[PDB]
C-alpha cells in the first residue's frame, strides 16, 4: 500500500500546487513595511533559579505563569513583577506550562509524562494539584487548556491527547505523528488545534472529531514551536532548521518562510502580535527576532537574554511580549 | 503603593525568600544522569544506590546525589537531553556480557556512548562509565571470543584483556580534554558502586576546581 500512499501524497502535492497562484511575498509587495519594531525590556521577572522552559500569559494580560527546571511554577504579576504564586512541582523536569483561560487553573508537565493541573483558586490559600493527567508514555512538551475541564497535551510519545480534567481521562487521543510532538496551538475558537512534531510536520486536528484534518510539511528539521495566526486561518511553526514557516489552513500549504542567513540556531518559541503582522520567534542564539509576518522581513530583535530564549508569549491584548530563557529570567517587552 | 499592593509585595518577597532558600538547597545536590541501553546494568546500579523519569536521591559521605534515571523515555533524547546539561556527571551503564548478543548490544551501547560523549550539551561533562555484568562476561568470554563484537580485536581472549579492550573502545569516544571517563567493572554483587560514583564525583569536582584555578 506504499504505492497508494505515495500516489495520494503526490495528489496532495498537486492540489497544493494548483492553489499556489501567487506567494505571500508577491501580494504583500506593496504594503508599507514596518520600520523597526524596537521593543524594550519593561520588566524583568527574576526568581527562577534554573532554565525556564515554558511561560504562558494569562487572558487578563497581566498574570503569567512560568515553568522552570528548578521545580517551581511561578505566577507573575507582570505589571508589578510581583510573584503571585510559587508552585513547587512534584517533578522538576517541567518543560510546558499552560495558564487556564479562566485563570482558575495552571498546568505543567514534562519528563514525568504527566500533565499536572493546579487549582490556583482554592478555599485554602495554597495552590494544589487538582488533577494529574497520566497516560502519555512520553514527556509532555505542550499543554493548552480549552476550558476549566478540557486540556490538550502534546507528548514525546508522538501523540496528542484531549483530557477531561474532572475524570482525569483521555477523552481523545490524537495519533498520527511519527516524531515526538513538541508544541501545540489551539485555535481562537478552540474547536481545532495544530501540533508540531519532530517528524518535521505540523498536523491540524479537530478537537471533537479527534482526527487529523491536515498535515503540513515544509520544515527540514524538528518543529519546536507552533502558533495560530490571530484569526485561526493560519499558523506559524518554529523548528530546529533555523526557519519559521507560515501555513494557511484553507490553502493547506506554507505561505511564507521566516529565515535569515545570519540565523543558524534552532527556534524554540513562536507567537504572533494581536493583529498578527508580527511573528515573534525565540531562538537558540539567546535572543528573540521579530518578523513581519506578511513580508517575512526581520522587523526587530529582542536581545537581552544571556541564554537560549526557550519560550515567549504575547498578551491577549497585545500590549506586551514576555520572553523566558534558559538564563532564568523572563522579560516583558513593549 | 496601596495597602493591598503593599501586602501583595510582601507576599512576593516571602515567595522570593522561599525561592532563594530552595535554590540554595538545590545547589548542594550532585545531579547524576543515568544512561545506558535497555538490558544494561542501569537498574542494578539503581538498586545498588538505593512514569517517564525516575529520580533516585541518596546521600553518601555528606554528599547528596540526585540520580536521574531516564531510560523509560523511549523517545528522541536530543529533545530532552538538554534538561540535564548541568549534571555533575553522566553515569553510563554498559553490559560487558553484551558483546556476544544482538538486539549488537555492545555496538548499540558504543553508539549511544559516542552520542552522549559528543553531545553539545555534554562537552565538559565527565562520565562515570560502569561496565556491568563483569562476572557474566567472564563466564561467556572463556567460551566465545571477543570477536563476535569486535573483529579488529586480534588480542588475547582472557577476561582481563577483553574487558580492557572494551573499556578502551568506550574511552576512545571521549575526545575531549575537559572531560574524563571513569570506568568501573561491576558484577551486580558488589556493594561499592556507591563508593565508585562518590570517588568519581569527588574527582570531577576537584578537577573542575583545578580548571578554575588554571591548574588542570
Amino acid at each position, epitope marked *: 500500500l506504499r504505492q497508494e500512499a505515495e500516489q495520494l501524497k503526490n495528489q496532495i502535492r498537486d492540489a497544493r500546487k494548483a492553489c499556489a497562484d501567487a506567494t505571500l511575498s508577491q501580494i504583500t509587495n506593496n504594503i508599507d513595511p514596518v520600520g523597526r519594531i524596537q521593543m524594550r525590556t519593561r520588566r524583568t521577572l527574576r526568581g527562577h533559579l534554573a532554565k525556564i522552559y515554558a511561560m504562558h500569559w494569562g487572558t487578563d494580560s497581566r498574570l503569567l505563569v512560568s515553568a522552570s527546571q528548578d521545580g517551581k511554577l511561578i505566577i507573575w504579576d507582570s505589571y508589578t513583577t510581583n510573584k503571585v504564586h510559587a508552585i513547587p512541582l512534584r517533578s522538576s523536569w517541567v518543560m510546558t506550562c499552560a495558564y487556564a483561560p479562566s485563570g482558575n487553573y495552571v498546568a505543567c508537565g514534562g519528563l514525568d509524562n504527566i500533565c499536572s493541573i493546579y487549582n490556583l483558586k482554592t478555599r485554602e*490559600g495554597n495552590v494544589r494539584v487538582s488533577r494529574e493527567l497520566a497516560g502519555h508514555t512520553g514527556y509532555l512538551s505542550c499543554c493548552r487548556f480549552l476550558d476549566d475541564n478540557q486540556i490538550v497535551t502534546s507528548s514525546g510519545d508522538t501523540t496528542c491527547a484531549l483530557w477531561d480534567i474532572e475524570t482525569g481521562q483521555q477523552t481523545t487521543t490524537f495519533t498520527g505523528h511519527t516524531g515526538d510532538v513538541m508544541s501545540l496551538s489551539l485555535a481562537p475558537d478552540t474547536r481545532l488545534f495544530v501540533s508540531g512534531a519532530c517528524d518535521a510536520s505540523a498536523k491540524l486536528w479537530d478537537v471533537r472529531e479527534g482526527m487529523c484534518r491536515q498535515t503540513f510539511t515544509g520544515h527540514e528539521s524538528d518543529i519546536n514551536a507552533i502558533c495560530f495566526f490571530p484569526n485561526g486561518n493560519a499558523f506559524a511553526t518554529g523548528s530546529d532548521d533555523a526557519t519559521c514557516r507560515l501555513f494557511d489552513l484553507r490553502a493547506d500549504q506554507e505561505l511564507m518562510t521566516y529565515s535569515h542567513d545570519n540565523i543558524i540556531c534552532g527556534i524554540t518559541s513562536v507567537s504572533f502580535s494581536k493583529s498578527g503582522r508580527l511573528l515573534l520567534a525565540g531562538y537558540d542564539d539567546f535572543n528573540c527576532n521579530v518578523w513581519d509576518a506578511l513580508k517575512a522581513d526581520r522587523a526587530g530583535v529582542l536581545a537581552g537574554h544571556d541564554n537560549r530564549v526557550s519560550c515567549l508569549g504575547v498578551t491577549d491584548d497585545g500590549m506586551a511580549v514576555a520572553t523566558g530563557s534558559w538564563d532564568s529570567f523572563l522579560k516583558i517587552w513593549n | 503603593l*496601596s495597602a493591598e499592593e503593599r501586602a501583595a509585595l510582601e507576599r512576593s518577597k516571602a515567595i522570593e525568600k522561599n525561592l532563594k532558600e530552595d535554590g540554595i538547597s538545590a545547589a548542594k545536590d550532585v545531579k547524576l544522569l543515568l544512561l545506558g541501553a535497555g538490558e544494561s546494568g542501569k537498574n542494578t546500579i539503581v538498586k545498588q544506590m538505593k512514569t517517564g523519569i525516575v529520580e533516585t536521591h541518596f546521600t553518601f559521605k555528606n554528599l547528596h546525589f540526585r540520580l536521574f534515571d531516564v531510560g523509560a523515555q523511549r523517545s528522541e533524547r536530543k529533545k530532552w537531553i538538554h534538561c540535564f546539561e548541568d549534571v555533575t556527571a553522566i553515569i553510563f551503564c554498559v553490559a560487558l556480557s553484551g558483546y556476544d548478543q544482538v538486539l549488537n548490544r555492545m555496538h548499540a551501547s558504543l553508539k549511544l556512548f559516542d552520542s552522549i560523549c559528543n553531545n553539545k550539551f555534554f562537552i565538559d561533562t565527565s562520565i562515570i562509565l560502569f561496565l556491568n555484568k563483569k562476572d557474566l562476561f567472564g563466564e561467556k568470554i572463556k567460551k566465545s571470543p571477543l570477536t563476535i563484537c569486535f573483529p579488529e580485536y586480534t588480542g588475547p581472549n582472557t577476561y582481563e584483556d577483553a574487558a580492557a579492550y572494551i573499556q578502551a573502545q568506550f574511552e576512545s569516544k571521549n575526545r575531549s580534554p575537559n572531560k574524563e571517563i571513569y570506568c568501573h567493572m561491576t558484577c551486580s554483587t558488589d556493594t561499592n558502586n556507591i563508593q565508585v560514583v562518590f570517588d568519581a564525583v569527588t574527582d570531577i569536582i576537584i578537577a573542575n576546581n583545578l580548571r578554575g584555578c588554571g591548574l588542570y
Partner: single-chain antibody
Amino acid sequence: VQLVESGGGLVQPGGSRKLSCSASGFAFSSFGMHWVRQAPEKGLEWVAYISSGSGTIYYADTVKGRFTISRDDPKNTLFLQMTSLRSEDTAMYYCVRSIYYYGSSPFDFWGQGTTLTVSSSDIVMTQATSSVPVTPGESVSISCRSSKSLLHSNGNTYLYWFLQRPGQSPQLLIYRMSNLASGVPDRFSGSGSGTAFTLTISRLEAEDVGVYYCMQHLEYPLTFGAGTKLEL
C-alpha cells in the same frame, strides 16, 4: 476552612487576656490575619492586622500600644494580646482571613467570633441609610460614601461589602468595588466610582436580611461604615 476564636468571657476594666484563633482547613501561614470587633449594638470596627509571615503588623489607633496581635503558624493560631481593657473594648471579636495577591479576595472568611465583655486622617465610610425595609424578590441598592476616593492610581477601588446575617458572623459579598466574592450568588452587584458606592441586590431572598457593611482597604486604618440593616 474554619476559624475558631477563643477567649472572650468577662473581665474587669484594666485587666488583660489573650484572644486565640484556632485556624484549620486552610493554609493559615499564607493569609494575613485581622481582628475585627463589633460592639454589642454598633457596627464592625477593624482592630488589628498581622500579615502573612508576621512581617507587617497594624493596629487601630484606639487599641495601638495596648493590644498586641500575634500568630503562631506551626499551630495555625492567631492571638490578640489585650492589655488595659477599657470598657470600650467590649465587643464580639472576629478573626478575619485575608490574603493579598493580584486578584485575591481579602476578608473572605470570618471566624465565628468570641464576645469580650468588660464591666463598668482615617478614611470615613458613610452608610447614610440604615434599617431599610425590603420586600423579597425586588431589587434594593445599599449606598456607601467615602471621605476619600477609594479608587487608587492602580485602577482598583478598595471598597468591601460584607453581609452580617442575624446571629451569624460577617460574610464577604464584594471585595474590591464590583468584584463578587466566592460562593456569593451573582445577584449581588457592586458599583460606584471615587467616593460614592452602591451595592445592588437583584432579587433579595429571605437570607439577605442582615446588616451590610462597607470597608475601605486603601489606607490601612480600615474603617467600616455603620451597617445598613435590611429588614423584612
